[PDB]
Amino acid sequence: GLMQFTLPVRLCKEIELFHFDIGPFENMWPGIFVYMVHRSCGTSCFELEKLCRFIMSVKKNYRRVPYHNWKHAVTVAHCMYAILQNNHTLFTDLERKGLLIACLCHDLDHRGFSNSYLQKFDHPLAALYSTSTMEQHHFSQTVSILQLEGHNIFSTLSSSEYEQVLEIIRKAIIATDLALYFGNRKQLEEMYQTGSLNLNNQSHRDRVIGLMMTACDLCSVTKLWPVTKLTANDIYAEFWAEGDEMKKLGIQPIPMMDRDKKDEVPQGQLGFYNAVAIPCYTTLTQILPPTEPLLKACRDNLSQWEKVIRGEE
Ligand SMILES: O=C(N[C@@H]1CCN(c2ccccn2)C1)c1nc(C2CC2)ccc1Nc1cncnc1
Ligand SMILES: [Mg+2]
Ligand SMILES: [Zn+2]
């Protein structure tokens, strides 16, 4: 109860900003995450003995892959923290609780491969879940860690409060399947443009929480350029691994995943910002106007990729 986590001044101040980078020191991330649960939720939401043991089980079930790692888990949890703070009153007490856990858990036990490479490889997880293959695996993995003796952070919730929170988490986690982002955003654009959009409509919140999860999941494009540029290296380390695996199944992989086609990266970043990132954050600022900074940073990084092509860095 009477324990606070207190970060250093620079972190204390930088963490409130959308663009915050959680730094290269693995052994502070668990504390940065608690810091965010207490400031976002209450020093009450969870018992610190339970939360810590949940965090270190979650850390342990991420894998040492180039991008879909523990670092990303917590990066994506901080973007949700930033969204939750600058929209204090739009979100229920349960939703703040669920969504930060959601974010921390959203890529649990990823192996560095797309839902696509699972199906072409005929991995068992592709027989168990026909679509959002990894994302259903990640939710399953979260339900599993919550059920370890001593790990149920949600134990001090009514039967009903409990079922709501695992259902927020479930949908949140499914929504980080980029294949369900496209339809979800078209609907939300249409719903705020035609004015029908209703945040008391539970099914409409669902869509809005889904957008946030794509926004938080993609939040690596919203960072300062050096951060975004060095994160891009890690993201293509996985994509190119996957490409090599595709090639060993005797399948020419898409250019995104072909390490021969490095030359095509800047133009591939271009389409990705235009086709996915700008629309994501555009729609998200339209619906939660204090999220504007993510659109402005994303815009800025687009311009930085425009400069790489023009042959100026
Ligand atoms: O970059 C992404 N996609 C584009 C799509 C065409 N493309 C090409 C195409 C040809 C050659 C080279 N690249 C690359 C991208 N994709 C995803 C999921 C969709 C899997 C998540 C993040 C991404 N970006 C990113 C992440 N973290 C920091 N910075 C950026
Ligand atoms: Mg994922
Ligand atoms: Zn992710």
PDB file of C-alpha atoms in Angstrom, residues 1-303:
ATOM      1  CA  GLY A   1       0.000   0.000   0.000  1.00  0.00           C
ATOM      2  CA  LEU A   2       2.340   2.770   1.371  1.00  0.00           C
ATOM      3  CA  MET A   3       5.081   1.744  -1.159  1.00  0.00           C
ATOM      4  CA  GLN A   4       5.311   3.931  -4.269  1.00  0.00           C
ATOM      5  CA  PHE A   5       7.733   3.245  -7.113  1.00  0.00           C
ATOM      6  CA  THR A   6       9.569   6.537  -7.935  1.00  0.00           C
ATOM      7  CA  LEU A   7      11.611   6.659 -11.147  1.00  0.00           C
ATOM      8  CA  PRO A   8      14.548   9.061 -11.658  1.00  0.00           C
ATOM      9  CA  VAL A   9      13.599  12.646 -12.589  1.00  0.00           C
ATOM     10  CA  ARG A  10      14.318  12.149 -16.353  1.00  0.00           C
ATOM     11  CA  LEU A  11      12.125   8.988 -16.473  1.00  0.00           C
ATOM     12  CA  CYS A  12       9.495  10.462 -14.065  1.00  0.00           C
ATOM     13  CA  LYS A  13       9.196  13.311 -16.696  1.00  0.00           C
ATOM     14  CA  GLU A  14       9.807  11.442 -20.034  1.00  0.00           C
ATOM     15  CA  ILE A  15       7.340   8.544 -19.285  1.00  0.00           C
ATOM     16  CA  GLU A  16       4.327  10.874 -19.482  1.00  0.00           C
ATOM     17  CA  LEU A  17       5.167  11.632 -23.127  1.00  0.00           C
ATOM     18  CA  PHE A  18       3.830   9.394 -25.929  1.00  0.00           C
ATOM     19  CA  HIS A  19       7.412   9.061 -27.420  1.00  0.00           C
ATOM     20  CA  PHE A  20       9.092   7.800 -24.225  1.00  0.00           C
ATOM     21  CA  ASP A  21      11.701   5.079 -24.820  1.00  0.00           C
ATOM     22  CA  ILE A  22      12.004   2.598 -21.860  1.00  0.00           C
ATOM     23  CA  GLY A  23      15.781   2.374 -22.312  1.00  0.00           C
ATOM     24  CA  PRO A  24      18.280  -0.476 -22.659  1.00  0.00           C
ATOM     25  CA  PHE A  25      18.197  -1.597 -18.948  1.00  0.00           C
ATOM     26  CA  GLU A  26      15.976  -4.793 -18.904  1.00  0.00           C
ATOM     27  CA  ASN A  27      15.960  -4.800 -15.050  1.00  0.00           C
ATOM     28  CA  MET A  28      13.984  -1.474 -14.745  1.00  0.00           C
ATOM     29  CA  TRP A  29      11.199  -2.435 -17.190  1.00  0.00           C
ATOM     30  CA  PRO A  30       9.240  -4.427 -14.482  1.00  0.00           C
ATOM     31  CA  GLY A  31       9.411  -1.331 -12.243  1.00  0.00           C
ATOM     32  CA  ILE A  32       8.458   1.077 -15.083  1.00  0.00           C
ATOM     33  CA  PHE A  33       5.376  -1.180 -15.604  1.00  0.00           C
ATOM     34  CA  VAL A  34       4.397  -1.086 -11.844  1.00  0.00           C
ATOM     35  CA  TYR A  35       5.064   2.684 -11.862  1.00  0.00           C
ATOM     36  CA  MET A  36       2.448   2.880 -14.679  1.00  0.00           C
ATOM     37  CA  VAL A  37      -0.134   0.538 -12.978  1.00  0.00           C
ATOM     38  CA  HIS A  38      -0.046   2.658  -9.735  1.00  0.00           C
ATOM     39  CA  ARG A  39      -0.246   6.037 -11.563  1.00  0.00           C
ATOM     40  CA  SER A  40      -2.888   4.786 -14.095  1.00  0.00           C
ATOM     41  CA  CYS A  41      -5.101   2.699 -11.823  1.00  0.00           C
ATOM     42  CA  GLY A  42      -4.284   3.099  -8.088  1.00  0.00           C
ATOM     43  CA  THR A  43      -1.713   1.606  -5.672  1.00  0.00           C
ATOM     44  CA  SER A  44      -4.950  -0.428  -4.827  1.00  0.00           C
ATOM     45  CA  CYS A  45      -5.841  -2.172  -8.226  1.00  0.00           C
ATOM     46  CA  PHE A  46      -3.548  -5.179  -7.413  1.00  0.00           C
ATOM     47  CA  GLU A  47      -1.598  -6.563  -4.413  1.00  0.00           C
ATOM     48  CA  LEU A  48       2.101  -5.890  -5.159  1.00  0.00           C
ATOM     49  CA  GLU A  49       3.110  -9.528  -4.198  1.00  0.00           C
ATOM     50  CA  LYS A  50       0.719 -10.896  -6.916  1.00  0.00           C
ATOM     51  CA  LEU A  51       1.482  -8.231  -9.589  1.00  0.00           C
ATOM     52  CA  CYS A  52       5.330  -8.701  -9.415  1.00  0.00           C
ATOM     53  CA  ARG A  53       4.960 -12.532  -9.640  1.00  0.00           C
ATOM     54  CA  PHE A  54       2.597 -12.080 -12.636  1.00  0.00           C
ATOM     55  CA  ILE A  55       5.142  -9.687 -14.360  1.00  0.00           C
ATOM     56  CA  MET A  56       8.120 -12.069 -13.960  1.00  0.00           C
ATOM     57  CA  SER A  57       6.023 -15.032 -15.269  1.00  0.00           C
ATOM     58  CA  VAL A  58       5.017 -12.849 -18.222  1.00  0.00           C
ATOM     59  CA  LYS A  59       8.636 -11.676 -18.780  1.00  0.00           C
ATOM     60  CA  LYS A  60       9.701 -15.383 -18.623  1.00  0.00           C
ATOM     61  CA  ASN A  61       7.204 -16.543 -21.312  1.00  0.00           C
ATOM     62  CA  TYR A  62       8.313 -13.919 -23.910  1.00  0.00           C
ATOM     63  CA  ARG A  63      11.238 -15.290 -26.004  1.00  0.00           C
ATOM     64  CA  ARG A  64      14.673 -13.851 -26.977  1.00  0.00           C
ATOM     65  CA  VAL A  65      13.581 -12.903 -30.550  1.00  0.00           C
ATOM     66  CA  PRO A  66      14.613  -9.630 -32.284  1.00  0.00           C
ATOM     67  CA  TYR A  67      11.342  -7.616 -32.025  1.00  0.00           C
ATOM     68  CA  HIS A  68       8.348  -9.515 -30.462  1.00  0.00           C
ATOM     69  CA  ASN A  69      10.179  -9.629 -27.125  1.00  0.00           C
ATOM     70  CA  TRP A  70       9.628  -8.477 -23.527  1.00  0.00           C
ATOM     71  CA  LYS A  71      10.955  -4.991 -24.491  1.00  0.00           C
ATOM     72  CA  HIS A  72       8.026  -4.749 -26.983  1.00  0.00           C
ATOM     73  CA  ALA A  73       5.491  -6.050 -24.430  1.00  0.00           C
ATOM     74  CA  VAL A  74       6.381  -3.086 -22.095  1.00  0.00           C
ATOM     75  CA  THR A  75       6.838  -0.512 -24.929  1.00  0.00           C
ATOM     76  CA  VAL A  76       3.237  -1.368 -25.996  1.00  0.00           C
ATOM     77  CA  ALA A  77       2.051  -1.207 -22.298  1.00  0.00           C
ATOM     78  CA  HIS A  78       3.545   2.318 -21.935  1.00  0.00           C
ATOM     79  CA  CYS A  79       1.785   3.631 -25.128  1.00  0.00           C
ATOM     80  CA  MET A  80      -1.534   2.409 -23.539  1.00  0.00           C
ATOM     81  CA  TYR A  81      -0.490   4.166 -20.257  1.00  0.00           C
ATOM     82  CA  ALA A  82       0.062   7.421 -22.263  1.00  0.00           C
ATOM     83  CA  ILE A  83      -3.380   7.051 -23.940  1.00  0.00           C
ATOM     84  CA  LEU A  84      -5.021   6.231 -20.580  1.00  0.00           C
ATOM     85  CA  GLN A  85      -3.530   9.272 -18.746  1.00  0.00           C
ATOM     86  CA  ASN A  86      -4.398  11.913 -21.446  1.00  0.00           C
ATOM     87  CA  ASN A  87      -8.047  10.558 -21.589  1.00  0.00           C
ATOM     88  CA  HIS A  88      -8.425  10.164 -17.762  1.00  0.00           C
ATOM     89  CA  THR A  89     -12.284  10.106 -17.730  1.00  0.00           C
ATOM     90  CA  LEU A  90     -13.162   8.263 -21.005  1.00  0.00           C
ATOM     91  CA  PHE A  91     -12.220   4.819 -19.541  1.00  0.00           C
ATOM     92  CA  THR A  92     -13.773   2.763 -16.712  1.00  0.00           C
ATOM     93  CA  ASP A  93     -11.688   1.519 -13.686  1.00  0.00           C
ATOM     94  CA  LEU A  94     -11.878  -2.136 -15.017  1.00  0.00           C
ATOM     95  CA  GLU A  95     -10.748  -1.066 -18.557  1.00  0.00           C
ATOM     96  CA  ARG A  96      -7.598   0.696 -17.229  1.00  0.00           C
ATOM     97  CA  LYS A  97      -6.818  -2.496 -15.163  1.00  0.00           C
ATOM     98  CA  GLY A  98      -7.483  -4.886 -18.113  1.00  0.00           C
ATOM     99  CA  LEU A  99      -5.906  -2.915 -20.995  1.00  0.00           C
ATOM    100  CA  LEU A 100      -2.453  -2.445 -19.341  1.00  0.00           C
ATOM    101  CA  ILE A 101      -2.306  -6.201 -18.604  1.00  0.00           C
ATOM    102  CA  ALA A 102      -3.616  -6.871 -22.129  1.00  0.00           C
ATOM    103  CA  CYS A 103      -0.758  -4.827 -23.614  1.00  0.00           C
ATOM    104  CA  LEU A 104       1.933  -6.484 -21.457  1.00  0.00           C
ATOM    105  CA  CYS A 105       0.521  -9.923 -22.439  1.00  0.00           C
ATOM    106  CA  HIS A 106      -0.403  -9.251 -26.142  1.00  0.00           C
ATOM    107  CA  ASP A 107       2.522 -11.113 -27.890  1.00  0.00           C
ATOM    108  CA  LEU A 108       3.114 -13.719 -25.125  1.00  0.00           C
ATOM    109  CA  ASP A 109       5.315 -16.688 -26.386  1.00  0.00           C
ATOM    110  CA  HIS A 110       5.734 -15.228 -29.942  1.00  0.00           C
ATOM    111  CA  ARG A 111       8.400 -17.095 -31.989  1.00  0.00           C
ATOM    112  CA  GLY A 112       9.215 -14.284 -34.500  1.00  0.00           C
ATOM    113  CA  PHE A 113       6.803 -15.630 -37.292  1.00  0.00           C
ATOM    114  CA  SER A 114       3.538 -14.332 -38.886  1.00  0.00           C
ATOM    115  CA  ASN A 115       0.223 -16.236 -38.636  1.00  0.00           C
ATOM    116  CA  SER A 116       0.943 -16.793 -42.411  1.00  0.00           C
ATOM    117  CA  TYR A 117       4.163 -18.833 -41.897  1.00  0.00           C
ATOM    118  CA  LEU A 118       2.373 -21.031 -39.303  1.00  0.00           C
ATOM    119  CA  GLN A 119      -0.205 -22.095 -41.951  1.00  0.00           C
ATOM    120  CA  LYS A 120       2.338 -22.653 -44.802  1.00  0.00           C
ATOM    121  CA  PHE A 121       4.449 -24.643 -42.258  1.00  0.00           C
ATOM    122  CA  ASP A 122       1.314 -26.366 -40.909  1.00  0.00           C
ATOM    123  CA  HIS A 123       2.346 -25.670 -37.295  1.00  0.00           C
ATOM    124  CA  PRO A 124      -0.085 -27.253 -34.776  1.00  0.00           C
ATOM    125  CA  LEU A 125      -1.300 -23.827 -33.449  1.00  0.00           C
ATOM    126  CA  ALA A 126      -2.760 -23.368 -37.048  1.00  0.00           C
ATOM    127  CA  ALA A 127      -4.907 -26.549 -36.561  1.00  0.00           C
ATOM    128  CA  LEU A 128      -6.125 -25.308 -33.118  1.00  0.00           C
ATOM    129  CA  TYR A 129      -7.074 -21.706 -34.273  1.00  0.00           C
ATOM    130  CA  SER A 130      -7.924 -21.119 -37.982  1.00  0.00           C
ATOM    131  CA  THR A 131      -7.480 -17.265 -37.696  1.00  0.00           C
ATOM    132  CA  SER A 132      -5.723 -14.811 -35.440  1.00  0.00           C
ATOM    133  CA  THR A 133      -3.548 -18.007 -34.807  1.00  0.00           C
ATOM    134  CA  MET A 134      -0.857 -16.365 -32.625  1.00  0.00           C
ATOM    135  CA  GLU A 135      -3.305 -13.848 -31.049  1.00  0.00           C
ATOM    136  CA  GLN A 136      -5.541 -16.679 -29.720  1.00  0.00           C
ATOM    137  CA  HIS A 137      -2.327 -18.440 -28.514  1.00  0.00           C
ATOM    138  CA  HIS A 138      -1.258 -15.197 -26.713  1.00  0.00           C
ATOM    139  CA  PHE A 139      -4.657 -14.903 -24.938  1.00  0.00           C
ATOM    140  CA  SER A 140      -4.499 -18.613 -23.976  1.00  0.00           C
ATOM    141  CA  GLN A 141      -0.944 -18.028 -22.653  1.00  0.00           C
ATOM    142  CA  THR A 142      -2.332 -15.066 -20.505  1.00  0.00           C
ATOM    143  CA  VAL A 143      -5.242 -17.177 -19.089  1.00  0.00           C
ATOM    144  CA  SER A 144      -2.562 -19.820 -18.268  1.00  0.00           C
ATOM    145  CA  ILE A 145      -0.255 -17.440 -16.301  1.00  0.00           C
ATOM    146  CA  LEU A 146      -3.255 -15.971 -14.351  1.00  0.00           C
ATOM    147  CA  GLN A 147      -4.016 -19.603 -13.170  1.00  0.00           C
ATOM    148  CA  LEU A 148      -0.525 -20.365 -11.729  1.00  0.00           C
ATOM    149  CA  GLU A 149      -0.893 -20.640  -7.881  1.00  0.00           C
ATOM    150  CA  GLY A 150      -0.187 -17.047  -6.637  1.00  0.00           C
ATOM    151  CA  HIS A 151      -0.540 -15.190 -10.012  1.00  0.00           C
ATOM    152  CA  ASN A 152      -4.262 -14.174 -10.058  1.00  0.00           C
ATOM    153  CA  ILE A 153      -3.967 -10.322  -9.871  1.00  0.00           C
ATOM    154  CA  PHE A 154      -7.815 -10.246 -10.535  1.00  0.00           C
ATOM    155  CA  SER A 155      -8.794 -12.479  -7.504  1.00  0.00           C
ATOM    156  CA  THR A 156     -10.230  -9.414  -5.598  1.00  0.00           C
ATOM    157  CA  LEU A 157     -12.989  -8.803  -8.231  1.00  0.00           C
ATOM    158  CA  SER A 158     -16.642 -10.058  -8.084  1.00  0.00           C
ATOM    159  CA  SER A 159     -17.444 -13.048 -10.330  1.00  0.00           C
ATOM    160  CA  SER A 160     -18.853 -10.471 -12.888  1.00  0.00           C
ATOM    161  CA  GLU A 161     -16.051  -7.818 -12.752  1.00  0.00           C
ATOM    162  CA  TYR A 162     -13.748 -10.862 -13.354  1.00  0.00           C
ATOM    163  CA  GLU A 163     -15.603 -12.075 -16.508  1.00  0.00           C
ATOM    164  CA  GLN A 164     -15.700  -8.512 -18.016  1.00  0.00           C
ATOM    165  CA  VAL A 165     -11.922  -8.013 -17.463  1.00  0.00           C
ATOM    166  CA  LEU A 166     -10.891 -11.362 -19.192  1.00  0.00           C
ATOM    167  CA  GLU A 167     -13.320 -10.379 -22.042  1.00  0.00           C
ATOM    168  CA  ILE A 168     -11.747  -6.867 -22.400  1.00  0.00           C
ATOM    169  CA  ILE A 169      -8.254  -8.579 -22.398  1.00  0.00           C
ATOM    170  CA  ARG A 170      -9.442 -11.266 -24.920  1.00  0.00           C
ATOM    171  CA  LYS A 171     -10.813  -8.786 -27.469  1.00  0.00           C
ATOM    172  CA  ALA A 172      -7.838  -6.426 -26.858  1.00  0.00           C
ATOM    173  CA  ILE A 173      -5.425  -9.256 -27.660  1.00  0.00           C
ATOM    174  CA  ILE A 174      -7.360 -10.481 -30.737  1.00  0.00           C
ATOM    175  CA  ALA A 175      -7.442  -6.839 -32.035  1.00  0.00           C
ATOM    176  CA  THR A 176      -3.560  -6.770 -32.296  1.00  0.00           C
ATOM    177  CA  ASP A 177      -4.111  -9.137 -35.265  1.00  0.00           C
ATOM    178  CA  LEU A 178      -3.449  -6.494 -37.998  1.00  0.00           C
ATOM    179  CA  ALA A 179      -5.820  -8.512 -40.321  1.00  0.00           C
ATOM    180  CA  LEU A 180      -8.830  -7.306 -38.180  1.00  0.00           C
ATOM    181  CA  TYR A 181      -7.453  -3.672 -37.975  1.00  0.00           C
ATOM    182  CA  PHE A 182      -8.572  -2.709 -41.575  1.00  0.00           C
ATOM    183  CA  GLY A 183     -12.318  -3.471 -41.298  1.00  0.00           C
ATOM    184  CA  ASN A 184     -12.312  -2.109 -37.673  1.00  0.00           C
ATOM    185  CA  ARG A 185     -10.931   1.308 -38.712  1.00  0.00           C
ATOM    186  CA  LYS A 186     -13.235   1.646 -41.840  1.00  0.00           C
ATOM    187  CA  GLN A 187     -16.266   1.067 -39.501  1.00  0.00           C
ATOM    188  CA  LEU A 188     -14.896   3.588 -36.923  1.00  0.00           C
ATOM    189  CA  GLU A 189     -14.149   6.280 -39.611  1.00  0.00           C
ATOM    190  CA  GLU A 190     -17.714   5.808 -41.041  1.00  0.00           C
ATOM    191  CA  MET A 191     -19.160   5.851 -37.404  1.00  0.00           C
ATOM    192  CA  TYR A 192     -17.513   9.228 -36.331  1.00  0.00           C
ATOM    193  CA  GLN A 193     -18.013  10.861 -39.855  1.00  0.00           C
ATOM    194  CA  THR A 194     -21.775   9.868 -39.992  1.00  0.00           C
ATOM    195  CA  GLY A 195     -21.931  10.794 -36.218  1.00  0.00           C
ATOM    196  CA  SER A 196     -23.504   7.395 -35.126  1.00  0.00           C
ATOM    197  CA  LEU A 197     -20.366   6.611 -32.961  1.00  0.00           C
ATOM    198  CA  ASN A 198     -21.583   6.033 -29.333  1.00  0.00           C
ATOM    199  CA  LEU A 199     -19.079   5.357 -26.461  1.00  0.00           C
ATOM    200  CA  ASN A 200     -22.041   3.983 -24.318  1.00  0.00           C
ATOM    201  CA  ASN A 201     -22.617   1.388 -27.123  1.00  0.00           C
ATOM    202  CA  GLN A 202     -20.458  -1.468 -25.637  1.00  0.00           C
ATOM    203  CA  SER A 203     -19.859  -2.952 -29.171  1.00  0.00           C
ATOM    204  CA  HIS A 204     -18.569   0.562 -30.283  1.00  0.00           C
ATOM    205  CA  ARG A 205     -16.157   0.849 -27.289  1.00  0.00           C
ATOM    206  CA  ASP A 206     -14.914  -2.653 -28.313  1.00  0.00           C
ATOM    207  CA  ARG A 207     -13.965  -1.264 -31.784  1.00  0.00           C
ATOM    208  CA  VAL A 208     -12.393   1.937 -30.151  1.00  0.00           C
ATOM    209  CA  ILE A 209     -10.334  -0.239 -27.645  1.00  0.00           C
ATOM    210  CA  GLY A 210      -9.327  -2.265 -30.727  1.00  0.00           C
ATOM    211  CA  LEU A 211      -7.995   0.853 -32.462  1.00  0.00           C
ATOM    212  CA  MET A 212      -5.988   1.818 -29.334  1.00  0.00           C
ATOM    213  CA  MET A 213      -4.373  -1.679 -29.359  1.00  0.00           C
ATOM    214  CA  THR A 214      -3.297  -1.293 -32.996  1.00  0.00           C
ATOM    215  CA  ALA A 215      -2.091   2.262 -32.108  1.00  0.00           C
ATOM    216  CA  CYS A 216      -0.139   0.913 -29.039  1.00  0.00           C
ATOM    217  CA  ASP A 217       1.088  -2.196 -30.983  1.00  0.00           C
ATOM    218  CA  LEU A 218       2.411   0.029 -33.800  1.00  0.00           C
ATOM    219  CA  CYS A 219       3.755   2.621 -31.409  1.00  0.00           C
ATOM    220  CA  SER A 220       7.338   1.947 -32.627  1.00  0.00           C
ATOM    221  CA  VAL A 221       6.609   4.218 -35.689  1.00  0.00           C
ATOM    222  CA  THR A 222       5.656   7.128 -33.254  1.00  0.00           C
ATOM    223  CA  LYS A 223       9.117   7.334 -31.601  1.00  0.00           C
ATOM    224  CA  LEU A 224      11.975   9.778 -32.281  1.00  0.00           C
ATOM    225  CA  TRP A 225      13.665   8.881 -35.570  1.00  0.00           C
ATOM    226  CA  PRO A 226      16.843   7.219 -34.113  1.00  0.00           C
ATOM    227  CA  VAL A 227      14.528   4.912 -32.016  1.00  0.00           C
ATOM    228  CA  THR A 228      12.135   4.217 -34.941  1.00  0.00           C
ATOM    229  CA  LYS A 229      15.083   3.591 -37.303  1.00  0.00           C
ATOM    230  CA  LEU A 230      16.870   1.138 -34.918  1.00  0.00           C
ATOM    231  CA  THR A 231      13.578  -0.597 -34.102  1.00  0.00           C
ATOM    232  CA  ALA A 232      13.068  -1.085 -37.894  1.00  0.00           C
ATOM    233  CA  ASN A 233      16.348  -3.188 -37.882  1.00  0.00           C
ATOM    234  CA  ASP A 234      14.841  -5.592 -35.298  1.00  0.00           C
ATOM    235  CA  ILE A 235      11.468  -5.801 -37.118  1.00  0.00           C
ATOM    236  CA  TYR A 236      13.230  -6.752 -40.437  1.00  0.00           C
ATOM    237  CA  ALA A 237      15.512  -9.277 -38.561  1.00  0.00           C
ATOM    238  CA  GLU A 238      12.321 -11.313 -37.896  1.00  0.00           C
ATOM    239  CA  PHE A 239      10.733 -10.626 -41.363  1.00  0.00           C
ATOM    240  CA  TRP A 240      13.980 -11.823 -43.085  1.00  0.00           C
ATOM    241  CA  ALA A 241      14.247 -14.917 -40.761  1.00  0.00           C
ATOM    242  CA  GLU A 242      10.637 -15.758 -41.785  1.00  0.00           C
ATOM    243  CA  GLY A 243      11.605 -15.184 -45.459  1.00  0.00           C
ATOM    244  CA  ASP A 244      14.484 -17.679 -45.136  1.00  0.00           C
ATOM    245  CA  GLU A 245      12.027 -20.204 -43.544  1.00  0.00           C
ATOM    246  CA  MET A 246       9.479 -19.568 -46.362  1.00  0.00           C
ATOM    247  CA  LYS A 247      12.344 -20.345 -48.878  1.00  0.00           C
ATOM    248  CA  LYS A 248      13.092 -23.699 -47.135  1.00  0.00           C
ATOM    249  CA  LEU A 249       9.376 -24.631 -47.592  1.00  0.00           C
ATOM    250  CA  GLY A 250       9.967 -23.839 -51.389  1.00  0.00           C
ATOM    251  CA  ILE A 251       7.829 -20.627 -51.471  1.00  0.00           C
ATOM    252  CA  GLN A 252       9.213 -17.301 -52.776  1.00  0.00           C
ATOM    253  CA  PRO A 253       8.361 -15.018 -49.820  1.00  0.00           C
ATOM    254  CA  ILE A 254       6.820 -11.512 -50.328  1.00  0.00           C
ATOM    255  CA  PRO A 255       9.460  -8.733 -50.805  1.00  0.00           C
ATOM    256  CA  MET A 256       8.883  -7.518 -47.182  1.00  0.00           C
ATOM    257  CA  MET A 257      10.475 -10.836 -46.012  1.00  0.00           C
ATOM    258  CA  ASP A 258      13.227 -11.236 -48.683  1.00  0.00           C
ATOM    259  CA  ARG A 259      16.678 -10.109 -47.417  1.00  0.00           C
ATOM    260  CA  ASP A 260      17.887  -9.837 -51.071  1.00  0.00           C
ATOM    261  CA  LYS A 261      15.334  -6.999 -51.474  1.00  0.00           C
ATOM    262  CA  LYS A 262      16.828  -4.669 -48.758  1.00  0.00           C
ATOM    263  CA  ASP A 263      16.928  -1.849 -51.429  1.00  0.00           C
ATOM    264  CA  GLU A 264      13.028  -1.932 -51.317  1.00  0.00           C
ATOM    265  CA  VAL A 265      12.819  -1.161 -47.504  1.00  0.00           C
ATOM    266  CA  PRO A 266      12.353   2.631 -47.582  1.00  0.00           C
ATOM    267  CA  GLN A 267       9.493   2.280 -50.176  1.00  0.00           C
ATOM    268  CA  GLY A 268       8.025  -0.550 -47.999  1.00  0.00           C
ATOM    269  CA  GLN A 269       8.161   1.726 -44.961  1.00  0.00           C
ATOM    270  CA  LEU A 270       6.410   4.373 -47.144  1.00  0.00           C
ATOM    271  CA  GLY A 271       3.361   2.186 -47.948  1.00  0.00           C
ATOM    272  CA  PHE A 272       3.144   0.974 -44.350  1.00  0.00           C
ATOM    273  CA  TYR A 273       2.946   4.566 -42.910  1.00  0.00           C
ATOM    274  CA  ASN A 274       0.404   5.598 -45.680  1.00  0.00           C
ATOM    275  CA  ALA A 275      -1.619   2.309 -45.776  1.00  0.00           C
ATOM    276  CA  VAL A 276      -1.671   1.524 -41.973  1.00  0.00           C
ATOM    277  CA  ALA A 277       0.117   3.876 -39.529  1.00  0.00           C
ATOM    278  CA  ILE A 278      -1.205   7.318 -40.647  1.00  0.00           C
ATOM    279  CA  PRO A 279      -4.811   6.030 -40.957  1.00  0.00           C
ATOM    280  CA  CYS A 280      -4.530   4.266 -37.553  1.00  0.00           C
ATOM    281  CA  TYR A 281      -3.400   7.383 -35.643  1.00  0.00           C
ATOM    282  CA  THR A 282      -5.549   9.680 -37.868  1.00  0.00           C
ATOM    283  CA  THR A 283      -8.753   7.794 -36.878  1.00  0.00           C
ATOM    284  CA  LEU A 284      -7.463   7.522 -33.224  1.00  0.00           C
ATOM    285  CA  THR A 285      -6.884  11.367 -32.904  1.00  0.00           C
ATOM    286  CA  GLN A 286     -10.335  11.971 -34.507  1.00  0.00           C
ATOM    287  CA  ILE A 287     -11.885   9.804 -31.708  1.00  0.00           C
ATOM    288  CA  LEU A 288      -9.525  10.681 -28.792  1.00  0.00           C
ATOM    289  CA  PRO A 289      -8.149  14.116 -29.590  1.00  0.00           C
ATOM    290  CA  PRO A 290      -5.420  14.113 -26.857  1.00  0.00           C
ATOM    291  CA  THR A 291      -3.696  11.238 -28.893  1.00  0.00           C
ATOM    292  CA  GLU A 292      -2.656  13.897 -31.501  1.00  0.00           C
ATOM    293  CA  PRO A 293       1.074  13.607 -30.563  1.00  0.00           C
ATOM    294  CA  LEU A 294       1.233   9.995 -32.011  1.00  0.00           C
ATOM    295  CA  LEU A 295      -0.119  11.268 -35.382  1.00  0.00           C
ATOM    296  CA  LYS A 296       2.411  14.148 -35.336  1.00  0.00           C
ATOM    297  CA  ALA A 297       5.361  11.807 -34.498  1.00  0.00           C
ATOM    298  CA  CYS A 298       4.232   9.192 -37.086  1.00  0.00           C
ATOM    299  CA  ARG A 299       3.908  11.999 -39.708  1.00  0.00           C
ATOM    300  CA  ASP A 300       7.456  13.165 -38.739  1.00  0.00           C
ATOM    301  CA  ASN A 301       8.847   9.616 -39.239  1.00  0.00           C
ATOM    302  CA  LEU A 302       7.115   9.317 -42.638  1.00  0.00           C
ATOM    303  CA  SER A 303       9.003  12.518 -43.625  1.00  0.00           C
TER     304      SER A 303
END
